[PDB]
Structure formats: C-alpha cells, structure tokens
Nucleic acid binder design. Structure first.
Ligand code: NA
Ligand code: NA
Ligand SMILES: [Zn+2]
Ligand SMILES: [Zn+2]
Length: 327
DNA sequence: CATTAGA
DNA sequence: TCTAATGA
C-alpha cells in the first residue's frame, strides 16, 4: 500500500504506456498483474530477485525493479516521459471521444495539439466535436452546490412529464460528495420492466423535456435506454454563466432499479464489500439482481426487490445510508 | 461488460 | 459487421 508504492506506480506508468502508445496489450497486460501482485506483497521489496519470486514477475520486470530500487529512476521511463509522440497521445486522449485509437491516428497526421484539433475539426466526429468544444468545462469538477440545482430541475421535469417516473441521481453525489464529475441519473418507470418489451419514448420523452427547457444542450448519444448528454445551469442574471456539464440518463426496467441504484451509488469498495457478503449470506448480487445461491455449485432465481432495503434484508445487513457507503 | 456510433 | 469509446 506504500511499502510497494513506487514499484507499483512505475509499473503502471510502464503498463499504461504499452497499451496506448504502442499497441502491446500483452506487455501492457504484463505490467498490470505484476503491479497487482506486488501491491499485496506484505513486504518491502529489496531486489528484483526477491520480487521475481512473484507470480507474473519475470526476468523483464525484475530488471526494471532493480534499476528503480538502485537509482531513484528508470531510463525507459525517463525516455517515455520525455518523448513527444507518446506525450501527445497522452494528451489528445483528454478530449471526450478521443481514445488511444484516434489519438494515435491524429498524431501521425500531425495533430498533436488542441489548436491542431480545431484547425482540423473536420477530422472529428460529433462526440469529439463536442469534446473539443467543452474541453475546459469538461475537466472541471461539479460543486454539489450546483448538483443540488441541477438535480432540482431534473426531478421537476421528470415529474411534470409523467408523474409515474422514478429518478435518482446516484453517484458521489448521492454518497454525500462535495463535488462530482458528472451527473448520473437513474431512471425507470412502472410500465417498464424485465419482460414488457421496451418503450423507447419512455426515455425519449424526458430527453426532450429536458432539452425543451434548455437543460440539455447537446447529445453525445442517445439510444433506447441510455442517453449521454451535456447539461447546463441557466446562467442567471448574467456576469456569470455555467460550465457545460456531462450528464447521463438511463432507463431501467422497474423491476431492476435498486440493484442498479444500489450499484451505481457505489462506491467500488462498498460494492465488492457488499458483494462479498451476499456470498456468505447465500447469495449473489450484480448490477440488476440478487439471486440466492444453490449448493450444486451455483443457482439462480431473482429475488423480488422493492428498495435498497430489501437487498440488505436479503443479505441481512445493516442498512448503510448512502453517505456511509464509502467502503 | 454493456451500449451507442461509425464507416 | 467490427471496432471504437465512455461508463469507477
Ligand atoms: Na515467478
Ligand atoms: Na477521451
Ligand atoms: Zn518483510
Ligand atoms: Zn459519474
């Protein structure tokens, strides 16, 4: 956790590079398990030889580990850290809609900077167009202060459209967080569930409403159950406008809400931790359901869930408020 | 690990 | 159709 920190962070930097800059999924994949096992290793690694004893740790990485332990650095790392091409990919990739793929492609073409980005906006598709367009606004965290207003407005329209609608802004936000990165809004309705063959308009109705009153400014993507957009607080009586904010809306079959909701609220750790428990308690939990376990190794048979309570009950736990869903 | 775009 | 990207 810190006794092996550098070893791990070096290894990540290493790992991460293969993946993006070159396309060495293996190598890349190498560096990760290696960085995964050393993390757990309950002891200060003194040599690679020592490390080497590990699983996933081969000759390759031991080498590095020595140099890193020896001199507080790494040449391969110092060279990568320097290098423009790699540097560049690292950067382009920031634009929402730009994955390594395109990043490497642009790069080759000679599009290294953001400015290059603009001059060749033609080379960008809509997602990426908007990426560029709100590059700044995008990297900026959300004051819960703001979260509360946004949320305010969402709930009002959802309701006005149809009062049967059930929305939940899940996230860090839900878990009390002081700021968040994007607004994740959970959504299901009664007439929509597991079987009842969809109802696209069900998502589409609101998506409109929201754009209707100008809360939605753009659309990253929109399908029958997931809508990816851009929202924005009414820049009040001017002098101060609102940063454009990444927003995601999702439609759940009423019968699988809370699992979903439970799920998305996280945290990752509460998750696993909640997930690890249901196992001992004779179950199974996942993004949509909770099924009892059958001795034959496994089993199925989706339990009927009415609220984030039922799930606990099921695994007979203590209902942990979202605020305290941190671990 | 799943959904959407796109070419 | 495949392949990319976003989703902690
Ligand atoms: Na080994
Ligand atoms: Na990106
Ligand atoms: Zn020791
Ligand atoms: Zn989020």
């Amino acid at each position: 956790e810190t006794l092996n920190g550098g070893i791990t962070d070096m290894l990540t930097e290493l790992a991460n590079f293969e993946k993006n800059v070159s396309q060495a999924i293996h190598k890349y994949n190498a560096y990760r398990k290696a960085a995964s096992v050393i993390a757990k290793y309950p002891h200060k690694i003194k040599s690679g030889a020592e490390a080497k004893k590990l699983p996933g740790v081969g000759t390759k990485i031991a080498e590095k580990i020595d140099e890193f332990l020896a001199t507080g650095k790494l040449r391969k790392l110092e060279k990568i850290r320097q290098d423009d091409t790699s540097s560049s990919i690292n950067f382009l990739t920031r634009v929402s809609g730009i994955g390594p793929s395109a990043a490497r492609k642009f790069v080759d073409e000679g599009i290294k900077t953001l400015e290059d980005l603009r001059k060749n906006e033609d080379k960008l598709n809509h997602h990426q167009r908007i990426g560029l367009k709100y590059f700044g606004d995008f990297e900026k965290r959300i004051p819960r202060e703001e979260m509360l207003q946004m949320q305010d407005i969402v709930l009002n329209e959802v309701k006005k459209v149809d009062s049967e609608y059930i929305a939940t802004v899940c996230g860090s936000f839900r878990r009390g967080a002081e700021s968040s990165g994007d607004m994740d809004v959970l959504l299901t309705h009664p007439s929509f569930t597991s079987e009842s063959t969809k109802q696209p308009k069900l998502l589409h109705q609101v998506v409109e409403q929201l754009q209707k009153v100008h809360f939605i400014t753009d659309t990253l993507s929109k399908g029958e159950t997931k809508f990816m957009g851009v929202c924005q607080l009414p820049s009040k009586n001017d002098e101060k406008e609102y940063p454009h904010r990444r927003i995601d809306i999702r439609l759940i079959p009423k019968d699988q809400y809370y699992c979903g909701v439970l799920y998305f609220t996280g945290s990752d750790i509460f998750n696993k931790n909640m997930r690890a428990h249901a196992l001992e308690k004779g179950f199974t939990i996942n993004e949509y359901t909770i099924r009892p376990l059958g001795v034959t190794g496994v089993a199925g048979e989706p339990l009927p869930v009415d609220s984030e309570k039922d799930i606990f009950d099921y695994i007979q736990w203590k209902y942990r408020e979202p605020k305290d869903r941190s671990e």
